[PDB]
Amino acid sequence: VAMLFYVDTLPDTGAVAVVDGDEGFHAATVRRIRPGEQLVLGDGVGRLARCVVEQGGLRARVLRRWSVPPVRPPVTVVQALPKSERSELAIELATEAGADAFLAWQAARCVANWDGARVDKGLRRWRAVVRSAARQSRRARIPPVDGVLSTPMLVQRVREEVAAGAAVLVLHEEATERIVDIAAAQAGSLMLVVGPEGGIAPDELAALTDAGAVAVRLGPTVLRTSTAAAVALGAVGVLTSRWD
Amino acid sequence: VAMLFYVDTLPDTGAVAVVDGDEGFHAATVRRIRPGEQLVLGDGVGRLARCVVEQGGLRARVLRRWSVPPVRPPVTVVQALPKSERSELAIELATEAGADAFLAWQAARCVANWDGARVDKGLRRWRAVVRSAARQSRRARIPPVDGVLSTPMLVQRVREEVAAGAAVLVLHEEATERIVDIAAAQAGSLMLVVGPEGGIAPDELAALTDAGAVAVRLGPTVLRTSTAAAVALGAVGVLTSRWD
């Protein structure tokens, strides 16, 4: 199976392409791919190109180009992400599971205070992690990563999303409502809210539920920060036209 | 929220319990839990006990005991597991996702030859990994780990399972059948087959499909060895009475 490589701008059908020094070292020295073998190039924004290897630097000539339309209903994963290796994993698994975008949220039981620069460094790191998972998952569109939202910013976003016809689901353990019995197929968009390891506080939960979000449970399974979004995405895929 | 600790044998309602030296160091030195706080003890085989901390060693007196019946339809995760950190992760995420048992399989594109002792060491390691994930997932039943099956052993097991009314699903990328349109709710048992990183060979796939397994796809999402079972478990939870 052909390996995907992200490029800033996909070249035209006739044109050749050179893979960046670091990404091109992964193909010639790490993987060691012979010239004549055919790889796939992507702009990470919907466009894909089937390329044949001509020649440190990797030279591949486009055979054919095409674009992949965005998956509807798109799913946004809102996750309480601290500065940890566990956050990176959540972001990675959700990307493999097919998450369409990410919103980093600082919940009540998080509070790992960052400056303006640190939030920017932190988001750039997550973007690198998502780019890598997306590449290995042969994804045409790399899901965006944006943050870091406060609860009042998130609550305002839930109000805005619900009004625009989106289904906002808060993955909560002690929820009286099940994911199964939800108006999923009718919704034009979806937003999965995953709280921190310490869980969502009652004050935050009420604020989010009052905005239009619904607290939903994922069966008897205890919601784990690493698996919550990936398991919910598998449920959402079946409930919605996402896999149908 | 109370922490779960696995014990070989749960003591009676009146009786006190001492947590093992290594597991008891996790509560007094790692987590530092004050006496008077109440924890949960489990035998890892369906039985749970609510205990109050009396006193290196941790002394907890049972308040009340109870047993959790097995989840039906149970899901068995058959996974091509080599000796890697990626295998451990697959086993961990599936445990969080609610897998009921594991079968380690050596597929055509695996072949990391082990001796009788190594298979035994390897299975004991996976059991430790599953025990840890199960503990953090507050699981009453630790899913068993058994292997290492050959393709003819697996094919014979599929024939046996299908005959006993089980739905055997082979997670395959180029499958013409979708997980959505499957006789899931009627099945009394389920078996998810996850191949290696190199994928399932056509000869193995035919052997498994001829036995009674059905090649099923998980939407547009490229099946990744780490996420395949956890995403499928989320789909299976919705399709079956597992979450209903």
Swiss-Prot record, chains A, B:
UniProt keyword annotations, A-Z: Cytoplasm, Methyltransferase, rRNA processing, S-adenosyl-L-methionine, Transferase
GO molecular function (one): rRNA (uridine-N3-)-methyltransferase activity
Gene that encodes the chain: rsmE
Subcellular location: Cytoplasm
One Gene Ontology cellular component annotation held by this UniProt entry: cytoplasm
Domain of life of the native organism: Bacteria
Family, similarity comment: Belongs to the RNA methyltransferase RsmE family.
PANTHER family xref list: 16S RRNA (URACIL(1498)-N(3))-METHYLTRANSFERASE, RIBOSOMAL RNA SMALL SUBUNIT METHYLTRANSFERASE E
Catalysed reactions, as listed in the record: uridine(1498) in 16S rRNA + S-adenosyl-L-methionine = N(3)-methyluridine(1498) in 16S rRNA + S-adenosyl-L-homocysteine + H(+)
Name of the protein this chain belongs to: Ribosomal RNA small subunit methyltransferase E
Gene Ontology terms describing biological process: rRNA base methylation
Main localization category: cytoplasm
Role played: Specifically methylates the N3 position of the uracil ring of uridine 1498 (m3U1498) in 16S rRNA. Acts on the fully assembled 30S ribosomal subunit.
Coiled coil segments of this chain: none
EC annotation from Swiss-Prot or TrEMBL: 2.1.1.193
Pfam families from the UniProt entry: Methyltrans_RNA (PF04452), PUA_4 (PF20260)
CDD domains per record: RsmE-like (cd18084)
